[PDB]
Design a protein around this ligand. Sequence first.
Ligand SMILES: N[C@@H](Cc1c[nH]c2c(Br)cc(Br)cc12)C(=O)O
Ligand SMILES: N[C@@H](Cc1c[nH]c2c(Br)cc(Br)cc12)C(=O)O
Ligand SMILES: [Fe+2]
Ligand SMILES: [Fe+2]
Ligand SMILES: [Fe+2]
Ligand code: NI
Lengths: 231, 228
Amino acid sequence: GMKAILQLILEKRQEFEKLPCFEFVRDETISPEERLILYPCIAAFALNFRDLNRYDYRDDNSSDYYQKIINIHTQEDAKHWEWFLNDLELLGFDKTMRFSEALRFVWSDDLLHTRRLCHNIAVLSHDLEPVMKMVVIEAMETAGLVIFHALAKPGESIAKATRRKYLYVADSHVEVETGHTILEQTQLSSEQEEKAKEIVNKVFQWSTNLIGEFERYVKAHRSEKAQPTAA
Amino acid sequence: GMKAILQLILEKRQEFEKLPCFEFVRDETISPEERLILYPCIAAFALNFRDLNRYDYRDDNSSDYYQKIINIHTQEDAKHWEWFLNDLELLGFDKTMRFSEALRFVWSDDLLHTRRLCHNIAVLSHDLEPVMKMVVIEAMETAGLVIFHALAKPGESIAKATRRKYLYVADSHVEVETGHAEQTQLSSEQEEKAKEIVNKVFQWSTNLIGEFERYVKAHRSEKAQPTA
Ligand SMILES: N[C@@H](Cc1c[nH]c2c(Br)cc(Br)cc12)C(=O)O
Ligand SMILES: N[C@@H](Cc1c[nH]c2c(Br)cc(Br)cc12)C(=O)O
Ligand SMILES: [Fe+2]
Ligand SMILES: [Fe+2]
Ligand SMILES: [Fe+2]
Ligand code: NI
C-alpha cells in the first residue's frame, strides 16, 4: 500500500537518472566548465526552494508529530541557497549586469518550468495532511539527490583543479541530502494511496521539465562556459 | 449577495486609500524623486504578477462566461511588466550590480509580503470556480488602481519635468486599470468564501504597502535619479 509508493519513487528515480542532461553532465570527455553552463539557470529555482522550505512546508504552530519532523527537515534544506550563491561566484557566473537583465533572466520564458517548480509544489501541497506533505518532500528530495550526484562530478573536478571549496555542486551537499524513515512505519488509505501516486508522478514530471530547460539552455548558450579562477 | 461583496470591496478600498505610504506618495511638498524611492521594491511583484496572469488566472479552453472575461482581462494585465522595466530605467533605478545582489534584493526578508502576494493569490484561487476567481481578480485590480492612482502623481510630475514618456507610474496605466477595477446570485456558501477572499487580498495588499513604507524609511536617501 505504502510499499507501493516508496517503490514508485525508486522506479521514477531510475527513469529520471537516464535523462540526456545527466548523460551530458557526467561525460568526463567534456570540460567541467562546459558541463556547468546550466549553473546560472538554478538561480530561478534555488531561492524559491529556500522560500518553499521556510513558508510552505514549515508550520511552527503545529502539535502533529509528522509536521514536527517536516519542520526539522525544512530547516536544513532552507540553508542551501547560500551555497548556491557561493559556487555562483567561484564559477565566474556572478557577473555585473543591469538589474533589469537579472530580472529578465530569472523570468525568462526559457526558465518557466524551473521558475514555477516550487510554485507548483506549494499549490499541490497547501491542502495536504502532513503525511502526504512528507511524500512530496521525499519525492522532491529524491529528484534533488539525482541532480546533485550528477553536478558534483564537474563541480568536484573544478574544486580540486582550482583548489577552492565548492559547497553546492559538491560531495558535501550530496552527503547532507544523502542524510535526507517514519514513512516505512506508516499506513495509507486507498484515498491516501491514490493521492500519493498523483504526487510522485507530478513531482517527477515537474523535475523532468526543469531538467529539459537546463538541456535546452546548454545548447542555446554553448559559448558561456564557467570561468573559475585558480589559487 | 454579490451586492454586499462589491460594497465590501468599496469599504476596503476606502480603508486602503488612507495608508501612510499613499499620504507620502501624494505629498506634493516632497520632491517626486523621493516619493518614488519604493519603486525598485515592485521588482519583487511585477514579474510574479505577469506570471499569475499568464499561467494561474488564464484557461484558454473554457466556454464559461466568467473565464472568457478573465482571459481577455489577464491578456492586458500580463503586458504591464514591460512598462515596469521601462520606468525602472527612466527613474535611474536600473543600476549595474552583481547577479547575486539582484537575487538577494528580490528575495530580501524585507520584501517577503511583496514577493509572495502573487503566490498567496495562486494558492487561494487554484480550486475556485470562475465566478469566484472574478472576486479575487476584482479585489486585486481595485487595490492595484489605488496604488497606481497614487504613484502616477509623482510619476507624471517627473514625466512632464524631464519630457519623457512614463508607462507604469503614469495616467495611461491608470486608464487601463480604471477599465479593469457583475450582478450574479451566489450560494450563501459562496457569499461567505467571497468575503474571506476580499478580506485576504486587502490584508496581503496592506502587508505589501507596509513593506514599501519600511523600505522608504530605511533607504530615504535613495531617491530616483531621472535625467531631463
Ligand atoms: N538540494 C537542492 C534542492 C533540490 C531539491 N529538488 C531539486 C530539484 Br527537482 C531541482 C533542483 Br535545481 C534542486 C533541487 C538545493 O539545495 O537547492
Ligand atoms: N497594475 C499592476 C497590478 C497590481 C494589481 N494589484 C497590485 C498590487 Br495589490 C500591488 C502592486 Br505593486 C501592483 C498591483 C501592474 O501592472 O503590475
Ligand atoms: Fe540542498
Ligand atoms: Fe497594471
Ligand atoms: Fe488590470
Ligand atoms: Ni487547494
